[model samples]
Target chain A: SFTLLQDQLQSVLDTLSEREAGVVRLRFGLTDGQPRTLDEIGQVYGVTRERIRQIESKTMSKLRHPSRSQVLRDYSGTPEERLLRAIFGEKA
Target chain B: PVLPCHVGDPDMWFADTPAGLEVAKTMCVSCPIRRQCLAAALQRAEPWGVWGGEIFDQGSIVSH
Candidate 1:
């Protein structure tokens, strides 16, 4: 899930151009359950599959974890962690 | 300062599977704007892994 990646993701999304932002949402399934293939998404925008790939690849890379966020540096140990632990069990 | 992420560094993945990765590279290969991807990567000097045009993963960079 790249759980530690979400907050940074939101910041990146904020920085993107509106069109790129839409593409990000569509590509990552922000509004839907599953992401669309680049080609399929391209069709909706009158672009070639290649163009969509370009946009996606360009925009996606902009996401970054905060320099000193440290959100991901440590593990969360709480009831929520317990819930996640129960579901996915453990990483190790 | 550089923006957050860029084109290629190491972590970029065209696909999750090995075969899918090959196919992904093919797309990147024929890409007319490969340099743009590279430019983006260098511009960001991304922290974690590849984004636009570099190779950060262990194998593909070695293969190509």
Candidate 2:
């Protein structure tokens, strides 16, 4: 089940500010159970979709640091991981 | 026909500044081989820079 992941996820969220946490949760459906489009989440905060995207970007960057997130390694091979890898290029 | 990215300075794609990141994302947004390019980056675990409209720093997705 995703229970363990859910528990581990909290650690990551703890590292972010309330706003950053909310943006990450809404965008990734980490709590509400479904990933939301940036446009949809943006409407909730009275912000543009691009703003939401920027928040997500910044928050994820914070979480990507090994010192900040322990579960980073657990997501290996996942779609999100793959997508990010594709975006960054392979490590040589 | 050449891809838009093929003609630009490839190093800019991996730039670290905000302006550099924007340029990389803009170029990637309309890239015809976007999916393929992303797939490659994923396969390799690119450690930094912008790709497929997302920003990566030290092997993490920081923005999109």
Maximum-lDDT candidate: 2
lDDT, model 2: 0.60
**lDDT by residue for model 1 (A1-92), tens:** 54544444454455557777777677656555456788878888889889887676544443332221123324344333332232223431
The reply for model 2, stretches above 4 Å from the true place, is: A71-92, B1-64
Candidate 2, A1-92: lDDT as tens digits: 34555565676676567888888777656665677889898888899888887777756544543334324445444434432342233520
User: lDDT, candidate 1, residue A73?
Assistant: 29
- Kindly report which residue stretches of model 1 are placed more than 4 angstroms away from their true locations once superposed: A1-11, A65-92, B1-64
lDDT of 2 by residue, B8-54 (tens): 55446556588987887787787776777566545545566565567
Q: How is the predicted docking of candidate 1 categorized under the CAPRI scheme?
A: incorrect
Candidate 1 docks with a DockQ of: 0.05
- Weakest 10 consecutive residues, lDDT, candidate 2 chain A? A83-92
**What's the C-alpha lDDT at position A47 in model 1?**
91
